[PDB]
Amino acid sequence: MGVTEAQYVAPTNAVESKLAEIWERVLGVSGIGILDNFFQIGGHSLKAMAVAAQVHREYQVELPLKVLFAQPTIKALAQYVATRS
């Protein structure tokens, strides 16, 4: 009886997925498990870590997808980027 990483992390747009494995928490690296880090991989506290980690230097060049910063663990990521955008 052992739970394995079935829904391990969450690949989004290739670049994001590679980031997820490279940063995890970008500070304490201790969340990504058999279900990603719910919805707190690039924001939650200052709600901008991802905006500076991936957006500011990789996606602000083109388009900011967001939905991974302005939420601690609510579907607020959707109710933000699909309500204020």
From Swiss-Prot:
Domain of life: Bacteria
Residue ranges of domain Carrier in the record: 10-83
O-(pantetheine 4'-phosphoryl)serine modified-residue sites: 45
Record remark on domains: Consists of six modules, and harbors a putative thioesterase domain at its C-terminal end. Each module incorporates one amino acid into the peptide product and can be further subdivided into domains responsible for substrate adenylation, thiolation, condensation (not for the initiation module), and epimerization (optional), and N methylation (optional).
Family: Belongs to the ATP-dependent AMP-binding enzyme family.
Additional free-text comment from the UniProt record: Tyrocidine is a mixture of four cyclic decapeptides, tyrocidine A (D-Phe-Pro-Phe-D-Phe-Asn-Gln-Tyr-Val-Orn-Leu), B, C, and D, in which Phe, at positions 3, 4, and Tyr residues are gradually replaced by Trp, depending on the relative concentrations of these amino acids in the growth medium.
Entry function: Incorporates six amino acids (for tyrocidine A, Asn, Gln, Tyr, Val, Orn, and Leu) in their L-configuration into the peptide product.
Assembly notes: Large multienzyme complex of TycA, TycB and TycC.
Name listed for the protein in its UniProt record: Tyrocidine synthase 3
